[PDB]
Amino acid sequence: QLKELTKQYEKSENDLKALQSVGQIVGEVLKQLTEEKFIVKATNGPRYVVGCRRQLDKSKLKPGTRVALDMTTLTIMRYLPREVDPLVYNMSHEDPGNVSYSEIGGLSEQIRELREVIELPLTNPELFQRVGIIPPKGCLLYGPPGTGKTLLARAVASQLDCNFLKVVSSSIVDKYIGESARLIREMFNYARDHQPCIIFMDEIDAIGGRRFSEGTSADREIQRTLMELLNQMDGFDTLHRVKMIMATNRPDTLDPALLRPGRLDRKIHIDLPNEQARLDILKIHAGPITKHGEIDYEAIVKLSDGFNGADLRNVCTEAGMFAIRADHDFVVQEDFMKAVRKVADSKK
């Protein structure tokens, strides 16, 4: 009758002492530690002169420091570290699905090559100025669709250590003006904070160039966003620890400025499965479905080319569909054979 109210009621006395608190506005000190008074810049606010905490650590109050300020009296309070957006809904989380290079089929050259160019400067960086050159920064995963692009970086997502910044390039842009450039400088400054880091911007035709002349509102807002993204891929350093890679369809609509070796050096052409990669995809998506033994993969692969990985899991998906409305045990050979010949009906 007393310990219960003491614990789970007197623990909830905290609401009054925390209710007494007042909250503090934030701002950025435009430095000028005018000794006793500094000039700070509020977020949506004016620049103005503020007094100080009187026993604050003034010597590390660097120009461009997030600081908290009082509301009524307005004297500067306890400082802050440099913020992060919901880039937490960017870095801290993506699509790494314990997918490995086992699910990646038939492109071992491209994934060994991407793996070496992207994390092998992070394994042995000393061998490169040994040869006498800095490592490259970017790769552009241009290809026909399907084909393992977005995923490929899923396998890279679940096999690396650094914060794999996986972002869709069209959740970048917002309706407010100068906002997307805030987001992209926040992204790359966040990459400066945690190193080494990998920044995955797929589908990038949203920020993809071939800059225009005349739409003047919905495009020049992004053709100045691509200026900030471009002048921080380039920068005045080389970013020296972080490596971004971008995956898209339509490389023939991208900006020349963003393609010039430097922003994206080793442009990788991921390609449709030839025959060997076709049977690779067919075995991998034919794996966890129950099977036959001597199920003729070779006539399926021989049958009609020009598919994608997505189209071959569409084959096993349609054949499992055939058994699931046809009520059989697994498939038959005529269910793969009836599966490909309906996928082959699906042209453009």
Partner 1 sequence: DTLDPALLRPGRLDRKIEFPLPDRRQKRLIFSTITSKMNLSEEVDLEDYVARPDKISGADINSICQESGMLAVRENRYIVLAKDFEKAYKTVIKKDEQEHEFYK
Ligand X SMILES: Nc1ncnc2c1ncn2[C@@H]1O[C@H](COP(=O)(O)OP(=O)(O)O)[C@@H](O)[C@H]1O
Which residues here bind ligand X, judged by CB under 6 A? Answer: 104-107, 145-151, 247, 281, 308-310, 313
Task: Rank residues 1 and 213 by Cβ distance to partner 1 and give the closer one.
Answer: 213
Residue 127: name its binding partner from ligand X, partner 1, none (Cβ under 5 to 8 Å by kind): partner 1
Residue 132: name its binding partner from partner 1, ligand X, none (Cβ under 5 to 8 Å by kind): partner 1
Task: Rank residues 105 and 196 by Cβ distance to ligand X and give the closer one.
Answer: 105
Query: Strand 76-79 relative to strand 66-69: parallel, antiparallel, unpaired?
Result: antiparallel
Using rule CB under 8 A, residue 218 touches partner 1: no
CA triplet 107, 149, 120: central angle to 5 degrees?
A: 65
Which residues does residue 140 pair with via DSSP β-bridges, in sequence order?
Answer: 246
Residue whose C-alpha is closest to residue 232's, from 187, 166, 278: 187
Using rule CB under 8 A, residue 216 touches partner 1: no
Whether residue 145 is annotated as binding a ligand: the answer is: yes
- 3-state SS record for 174-195: CCCCCHHHHHHHHHHHHHHHCC
Cα gap 84→228, rounded to integer Å: 18
Q: And the tokens for 288?
A: 């966890």
Cα gap 198→210, rounded to integer Å: 25
Torsion of CA 249, 252, 258, 259, to 10 degrees: 100
Q: Which stretch binds partner 1 (CB under 8 A): 3-11, 47-55, 148-156, 257-265?
A: 257-265
Nearest residue to ligand X by CB is: 309
Residue 150: name its binding partner from ligand X, partner 1, none (Cβ under 5 to 8 Å by kind): ligand X
Site for partner 1 in 127-166 (CB under 8 A): 127-128, 130-136
Whether residue 273 is annotated as binding a ligand: the answer is: no
**Phi and psi, residue 198, nearest 5°:** -120, 130
Site for partner 1 in 263-302 (CB under 8 A): 265-267
Whether residue 27 is annotated as binding a ligand: the answer is: no
Residue 135: name its binding partner from partner 1, ligand X, none (Cβ under 5 to 8 Å by kind): partner 1
Residue 146, phi-psi category: left (phi > 0), alpha (psi -120 to 50), beta (remainder)? left
Cα–chain center distance at 257? 21
Residue 130: name its binding partner from partner 1, ligand X, none (Cβ under 5 to 8 Å by kind): partner 1
**Residue ranges of the binding site for ATP:** 143-150
**Residue ranges of the binding site:** 143-150
Contact residues: partner 1, CB under 8 A: 117, 127-128, 130-136, 213, 260-262, 265-267
